[PDB]
Design a protein around this ligand. Sequence first.
Ligand SMILES: C=CCNc1nc(N)c(C(=O)c2ccc3ccccc3c2)s1
Length: 294
Amino acid sequence: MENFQKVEKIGEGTYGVVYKARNKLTGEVVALKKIRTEGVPSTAIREISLLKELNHPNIVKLLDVIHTENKLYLVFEFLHQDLKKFMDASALTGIPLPLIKSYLFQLLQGLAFCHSHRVLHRDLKPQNLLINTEGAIKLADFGLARAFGVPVRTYTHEVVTLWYRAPEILLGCKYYSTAVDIWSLGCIFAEMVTRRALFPGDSEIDQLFRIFRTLGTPDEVVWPGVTSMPDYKPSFPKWARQDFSKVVPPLDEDGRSLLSQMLHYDPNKRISAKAALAHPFFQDVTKPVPHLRL
Ligand SMILES: C=CCNc1nc(N)c(C(=O)c2ccc3ccccc3c2)s1
């Protein structure tokens, strides 16, 4: 790019390559995402454009939408590190509980904001949760899923992670709700606590069965309507639910209680981000500074 002097390729996102770039007009460092294709839908341009107005301290700012040369670029504020790399970096010691709690609190504020504005993320994962040196954490890519579509890999063959996908999505429900983001965040919360992914499925069915083996195969009692879902099969094995005490030790009871509410099978029974912010788990929440190696 001419208006931007690439510093480095940050990696490959859901929709295309992402670079760390410098705006030659401002000297500002940003995250430039190329959106991988037969003209670029206008409905997309308009939708995405509306996202530029979404501002909240826990949402990565979408600075600009650039549609030129029949190519589409998204310009985002640049952040220091992603949660995935931070978790890997804290693997030996684990993230201190006060920081895990601060991050969860902030992420829920982010979701509460987006959800009140009717914007869903739909693909939350450690890779798109970004942190800075001051102890803030922000969600990147809210709303892109709806505006754009749903790719198999990314754009050039790249295994898309299914680890954080809500059960209703795996069972073929076509209408997503804000609850899919709460499910993903719950999975992320568990992963910060145990230092191991909660449901590391390697295929849609493996993903679904790992969920069932832990929370029990859902039925009409715990999830009214589940047996009528598009990809539900009466032949699904019937696994008993396991005790949460065994799932996220050594998380205390308030934490376990909150997580159970974020992982309810019925999307309608799953706790909302706003209600979760009032959960007693956050009664002693603070904002610690993390030890970031940049
Ligand atoms: C982690 C250091 C780079 N700083 C970033 N700042 C922003 N704003 C980023 C992203 O918005 C982002 C989010 C998800 C990604 C997933 C794969 C590859 C690059 C990705 C980039 S990444």
